[PDB]
Amino acid sequence: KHLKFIARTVMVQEGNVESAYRTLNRILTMDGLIEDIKHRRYYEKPCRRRQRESYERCRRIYNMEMARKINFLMRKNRADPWQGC
Amino acid sequence: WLIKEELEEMLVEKLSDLDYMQFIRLLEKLLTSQCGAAEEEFVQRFRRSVTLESKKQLIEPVQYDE
What Pfam families does UniProt report for this protein, alphabetically (chain A)? Predict the structure, then answer.
């Protein structure tokens, strides 16, 4: 019922179809459409869906905290200033 | 550079491979700088001499017949 060639459309630049498809796939991935399709192939029962969502939220929390710690400590990867002591 | 066994013989103390690595790294860092005569003598205390045997083939003497 909507207009066509507006949603999920990426224009190809100078026949660079590879990059256009990469951009389209990146858009779908960032918006979460690809994972949604993959999960909608077979029905996910509500208990399984809740378990998956809880696991993914805990994973997101842990990954974000670990990334924050890594970025915080990365400055300390520099050379040893007190070598030999 | 002297091997770990030579360093242990010099120091009369048991050592570890990582301790030897730290010591050798410190000595190399000492060499890299604008070291003076005493700083070079200290390094030469630990430096050992290696006999570079030439792979050049020995040439037979030219003999003469009757």
Answer: Ribosomal_S21 (PF01165)
B-chain residues near A84 (CB < 8 A): 22, 25-26, 29
The span from the CA of A22 to the CA of A13, in Å, is 12
Tell me if B47 sits within 8 A of B1, measured CB to CB.
yes
Between CA B25 and CA B39 the distance in angstroms is: 15
Where does residue A32 fall: left (phi above 0), alpha (psi -120 to 50 degrees), or beta otherwise?
Answer: left
How far, in Å, CA of A32 to CA of A39, rounded? 11
Residue of B nearest to A83 (CA): B26
- Kindly give, in sequence order, each residue whose CB lies less than 8 Å from that of residue A21, ignoring residues fewer than 6 positions away: A10
Q: What is the 3-state secondary structure (H, E, C) of chain A?
A: CCCCCCCCCCCCCCCCHHHHHHHHHHHHHHCCHHHHHHHHCCCCCHHHHHHHHHHHHHHHHHHHHHHHHHHHHHHHHCCCCCCCC
Q: By what technique were these coordinates determined? A: cryo-EM
Angle at B28 between CA B35 and CA B12, to 5 degrees: 105
**A84: closest CA of chain B, how far (Å):** 6
Q: B14 with B61: CB under 8 angstroms?
A: no
